[PDB]
Amino acid sequence: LLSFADGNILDEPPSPPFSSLLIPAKRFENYKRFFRDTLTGDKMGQRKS
């Protein structure tokens, strides 16, 4: 029952359910674009989108 903050941002402020700050979600959308067009892809089996 103890996290060690492995692969996330160090100081990430809370999001619209708790706060009204849209900065982490605005960065998360570009993170998802990165996860689309250089790995994973749109569908399973596609090498890059």
Binding site: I9, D11, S19, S20, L21, L22, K26
Partner: protein, 370 residues
């Protein structure tokens, strides 16, 4: 526009224009020590001061009735007092406030940045068991946070827990809140303000700039009082505009280790200074604890008389010197001496990280070429 300073003085004089006021009640200090309050609360404060003077069976002399009237609406209601059964709670919730006031007086000496102590209460009045009120200095002293001021604030944070530890001879949970406050203040010291020596000039590659309160949404209505928020949010300039927010890349584990080591160094230095002060003023601390247990509420004036009446015993030489000795902490600073080039005292780093280029430049251009 809420009234303040001169307006608060005018409101207090208007509400005290028909009531006799003793000269010991500093109207200017009372106005500066009650920030953000309006006439619709100062009228109640003067009202309760008058009723407390009436119930006391005398005229409106001394500052204790005024302070009780302020406390009745800043820290609402009066809880039952601490029990006289067992010597634990009366000792803890006197030792923490005695140590905070003592460290405040000692930092008022030498440096002078720490404001004077108004009073220490240790009578539970709403949501708390003990208090230490600080005579809020004039504004424009809070519009800017200085390195020495932040160091003094970290010391004043650690003071209560280390005073409880010095009194009991034992670590308690009273250091938990002080550690929680002092770690946040030390992170602001090292990262955001850049007062430390991290990197050799104190400028780290990452800093967590605070955000605005407009993202809070909930905005719990505590109202009035205005605590150390007056020193915290006044010097900090928040973000307010998400379009122009800079957060920097998050630092790696190695540089985060170095930066948190710098934070630990700041905390260790402040903690050792506080422990040295409380070890050298044990007699004054114990006299203040006894006076607090005897008289419950106590003013900062009488505390200054007690601490002057029990000064330090010059040089403790031996036996009493063994309290100053071993009052240093055994906490580990990883990057102290030779561990500040690349391994940083880590035996596994070379088994995980494959020797960065600037590390190789440090070990080749500087080392093995001098």
């Amino acid at each position: 526009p809420k009234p303040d300073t001169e307006g608060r003085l005018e409101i207090l004089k208007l509400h005290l224009r028909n009531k006799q006021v003793a000269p010991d009640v500093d109207l200017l200090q009372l106005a500066r020590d009650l920030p953000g309050l309006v006439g619709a609360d100062l009228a109640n404060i003067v009202n309760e001061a008058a009723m407390t003077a009436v119930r006391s069976g005398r005229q409106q002399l001394t500052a204790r009735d005024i302070y009780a009237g302020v406390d009745r609406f800043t820290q609402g209601e009066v809880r039952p007092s601490l029990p006289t059964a067992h010597k634990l709670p009366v000792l803890c919730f006197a030792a923490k406030e005695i140590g905070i006031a003592l460290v405040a007086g000692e930092l008022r000496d030498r440096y002078g940045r720490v404001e004077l102590v108004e009073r220490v209460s240790i009578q539970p009045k709403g949501r708390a068991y003990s208090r230490t009120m600080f005579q809020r200095g004039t504004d424009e002293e809070y519009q800017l946070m200085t390195r020495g001021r932040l160091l003094d604030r970290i010391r004043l944070a650690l003071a209560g827990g280390f005073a409880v530890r010095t009194a009991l001879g034992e670590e308690t949970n009273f250091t938990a809140a002080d550690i929680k406050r002092a770690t946040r203040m030390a992170k602001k010291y090292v990262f955001y303000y850049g007062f430390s020596e991290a990197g050799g000039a104190g400028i780290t590659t990452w800093a967590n700039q605070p955000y605005s309160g407009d993202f809070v949404i909930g905005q719990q209505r505590a109202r009035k009082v205005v605590s150390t928020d007056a020193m915290d949010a006044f010097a900090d300039w928040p973000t307010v505009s998400e379009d122009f927010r800079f957060d920097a890349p998050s630092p790696s584990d190695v540089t985060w280790h170095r930066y948190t080591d710098e934070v630990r160094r700041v905390l260790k230095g402040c903690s050792e200074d506080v422990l040295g002060i409380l070890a050298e003023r044990q007699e004054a601390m114990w006299a203040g604890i006894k006076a607090l247990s005897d008289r419950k509420e106590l003013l900062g004036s009488e505390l200054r008389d007690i601490f002057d009446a029990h000064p330090a015993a010059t040089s403790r030489d031996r036996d009493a010197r063994a309290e100053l000795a071993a009052a240093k902490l055994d906490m580990t600073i990883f990057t102290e001496g030779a561990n500040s080039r690349w391994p940083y005292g880590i035996e596994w780093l070379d088994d995980a990280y494959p020797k960065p280029y600037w590390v190789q430049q440090q070990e080749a251009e500087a080392a093995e070429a001098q």
